[PDB]
Amino acid sequence: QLHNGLDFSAKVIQGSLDSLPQEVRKFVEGNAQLCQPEYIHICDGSEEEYGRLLAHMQEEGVIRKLKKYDNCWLALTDPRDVARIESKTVIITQEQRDTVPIPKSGQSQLGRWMSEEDFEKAFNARFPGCMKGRTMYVIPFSMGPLGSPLAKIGIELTDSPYVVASMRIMTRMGTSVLEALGDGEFIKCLHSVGCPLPLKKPLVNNWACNPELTLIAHLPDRREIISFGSGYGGNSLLGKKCFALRIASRLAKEEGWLAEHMLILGITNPEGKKKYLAAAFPSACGKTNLAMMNPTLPGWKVECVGDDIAWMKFDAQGNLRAINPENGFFGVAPGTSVKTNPNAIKTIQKNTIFTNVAETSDGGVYWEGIDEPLAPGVTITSWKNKEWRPQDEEPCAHPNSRFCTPASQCPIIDPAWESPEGVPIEGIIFGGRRPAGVPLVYEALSWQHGVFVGAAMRSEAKVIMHDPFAMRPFFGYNFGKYLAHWLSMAHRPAAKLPKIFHVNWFRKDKNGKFLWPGFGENSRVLEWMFGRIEGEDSAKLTPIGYVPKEDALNLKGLGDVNVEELFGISKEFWEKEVEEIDKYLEDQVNADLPYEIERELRALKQRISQM
């Protein structure tokens, strides 16, 4: 160089730019030149670093220590920055059709495309100088067990220590990742809260964000994730949704594998047999509940591999092998109780960061549906930092409030949850919240029918909406092409295609009362699936697929469960259902709907027409 402007060595407060692989230095230094951070901190992922970072956030008023627990912390956000924001989440490709099918109605529910030229303008209006007066943290992270053949590495730059702490929990991060990477490829992840110093606008609740300029972008062809303006969860912790679902699903398409919005659990029966199952559910359908369920059936065990995301690839033997690419759980707090999720309660009592929950007088946590009384004298501070009484109209915790907790701490974490080869998936479960019409459990008639069942997924938001594969907000590319990708798995010689099931825990009677007790009782449905995978003759054929035979389900210990209503299938309901599915698929998928999905649709309408 001719002057002193391109070498950022003098500003490195941890690590060394010289030590980084060539491409990692270029990524760091080039974005330092653009964002103008005061300091550069190359994260080592050590306990020392983590402790120091947390104490600093505490010293700044960014987080509070929760004194009741072992090393637990609370962040309360600006009320404007409280969730993943779909409307400001976009994917950039040369052609719109590579990102979303072109809808007949003109508005796609299946993603949000932005042109390269539009994004460049948006980028230029946000990032130049954005980290002025702040530290740029460099987070080297692995998605998946370090050195799993299914693992992928990222480098996230961020000006938020909250993101650093949370990424330590949610990914494998630090020096060993940099050493594992070498000169290999990595996903480029750029994040800024968008508040350069001196601050141009008021800081609310010591929580830096820029709501008006919030934009979460994915550029799969450039292997880049670029996120600006939000410090919250899926917007800022770039490994989780942006990388592990959006970028990864496109990589999966390119490379022959699957990046899915699925829990992974291992279930052991009383005959000492173990099987792994994956499950894709939409929001508020008991996903974490199922992943760390304690079964009510004696002699059965459930163990948790992951509660959110699965990366799956068929091996040389034809087994569908899955890994959890995450290193922790980022769960919705409200509704987490000893009765709904006792294992979550045990997990989150130490080494956990909470966001937007209430705090009790003795330094504990509180939220709606915690179902745990407080001793007289103990008072509650809401997530809005105000004194709170259960007589108030507003909740003590934000509905989207979170815990962020180490996976290793789950008392029923699966012994193979970090196995680099992954676990063999023998069943895949789709499901949604449906008050009417949809039986407790059915089984797809074939792989193609199963792909159709995923494609047709609907769930009560009240309004029933489509969430195919529970991937609606997360498709990395054209949904029609994603369906074709799924269907292509049947044409792999020797592929062992898992059995596909659909579940509905949420069927109500004519009064609005749930017909199924759920929770640990769901083990009875898992038992049925287990037997079906073993080839048990325990099914009855219906127009929608296989259901449990009369007396096939274990209902002992339950009272009088209304099986007729729970498993009832109405021609009138399913006529309406199939018509709605048809209209949705025609509109939203159009020219990109695979022939086999059109065929399954026709086949279902025909079976229904014959009842």
Q: Any binding-site annotation on 283?
A: yes
Q: Are 66 and 72 in contact, with CB atoms under 8 Å apart?
A: yes
The span from the CA of 21 to the CA of 611, in Å, is 65
Identified binder of Na ion from the candidate list 113, 119, 207, 506, rule CB under 5 A: 207
Q: Does 205 bind Na ion (CB under 5 A)?
A: yes
Least separation in angstroms between CB 264 and Mn ion: 13
Q: Are 96 and 158 in contact, with CB atoms under 8 Å apart?
A: no
Q: Which is nearer to Na ion, 73 or 442 (CB)?
A: 73
Q: Please identify, among the stretches 59-67, 193-201, 304-312, 543-551, the one whose residues bind Mn ion according to the rule CB under 5 A.
A: 304-312
Identified binder of Mn ion from the candidate list 49, 308, 414, 592, rule CB under 5 A: 308
Q: Does 307 bind Mn ion (CB under 5 A)?
A: no
Query: Cβ atoms within 10 A of the Cβ of 293, count?
Result: 27
Q: Are 348 and 405 in contact, with CB atoms under 8 Å apart?
A: yes
Buried b (16+ CB within 10 A) or exposed e, 190-199: bbbbbbbeee
Q: Please identify, among the stretches 73-81, 108-116, 297-305, 402-410, the one whose residues bind Na ion according to the rule CB under 5 A.
A: 73-81
Q: Which is nearer to Mn ion, 308 or 592 (CB)?
A: 308
**Helical (H) or strand (E) element with 179:** helix 175-181
Q: Let me know the angle formed at the C-alpha of 292 by 286 and 296, rounded to the nearest 5 degrees.
A: 90
Structure tokens given for 585: 């698929």
The span from the CA of 146 to the CA of 135, in Å, is 27
Label the pairing between strands 89-92 and 113-114.
Answer: parallel
Least separation in angstroms between CB 76 and Na ion: 4
Q: Any binding-site annotation on 607?
A: no
The span from the CA of 231 to the CA of 413, in Å, is 29
Q: Which is nearer to Na ion, 206 or 400 (CB)?
A: 206
Q: Any binding-site annotation on 261?
A: yes
> What is the total count of residues that contact Mn ion (CB under 5 A)?
1
Selecting among 189, 209, 242, 285, the annotated active-site residue is 285
Q: Any binding-site annotation on 276?
A: no
Q: Any binding-site annotation on 5?
A: no
Least separation in angstroms between CB 334 and Na ion: 19
437 to each of 83, 504, 582, 609, how far by Cα in Å? 32, 10, 17, 16
Q: Any binding-site annotation on 556?
A: no
Q: Which is nearer to Mn ion, 45 or 282 (CB)?
A: 282
Comparing every residue's Cβ against Mn ion, the nearest one is: 308
Query: Cβ atoms within 10 A of the Cβ of 75, count?
Result: 25
285 catalytically annotated: yes
Least separation in angstroms between CB 278 and Mn ion: 13
Omega of the bond leading into 198 within 30 degrees of 0 (cis)? yes
Burial of 597 per CB tally in 10 Å (0-12, 13-18, 19+)? buried
What's the order of all strands across the beta sheet hosting 365-366? 365-366, 358-360, 380-381, 387-388
Which of Mn ion, Na ion, none lies near 207, with the C-beta cut-off 5 to 8 A by kind?
Answer: Na ion
Q: Are 169 and 206 in contact, with CB atoms under 8 Å apart?
A: no
Q: Please identify, among the stretches 204-212, 307-315, 539-547, 574-582, the one whose residues bind Na ion according to the rule CB under 5 A.
A: 204-212
Q: Any binding-site annotation on 549?
A: no
Q: Any binding-site annotation on 433?
A: yes
Q: Does 600 bind Mn ion (CB under 5 A)?
A: no
Which of Na ion, Mn ion, none lies near 76, with the C-beta cut-off 5 to 8 A by kind?
Answer: Na ion
Which of Mn ion, Na ion, none lies near 308, with the C-beta cut-off 5 to 8 A by kind?
Answer: Mn ion
Q: Please identify, among the stretches 1-9, 51-59, 115-123, 308-316, the one whose residues bind Mn ion according to the rule CB under 5 A.
A: 308-316
554 to each of 150, 524, 528, 561, 563, how far by Cα in Å? 38, 6, 8, 11, 12
Q: Please state the residue numbers annotated as binding site for Mn(2+).
A: 241, 261, 308
Annotated binding site for substrate: 84, 232-234, 283, 400-402
The residues binding Mn ion (CB under 5 A) are 308
Residues of the shown chain interacting with Na ion in the complex, contacts defined by CB under 5 A:
76, 205-207
Binding residues: 84, 232-234, 241, 261, 283-289, 308, 400-402, 433, 519-522
Q: Any idea which residues carry the catalytic annotation?
A: 285
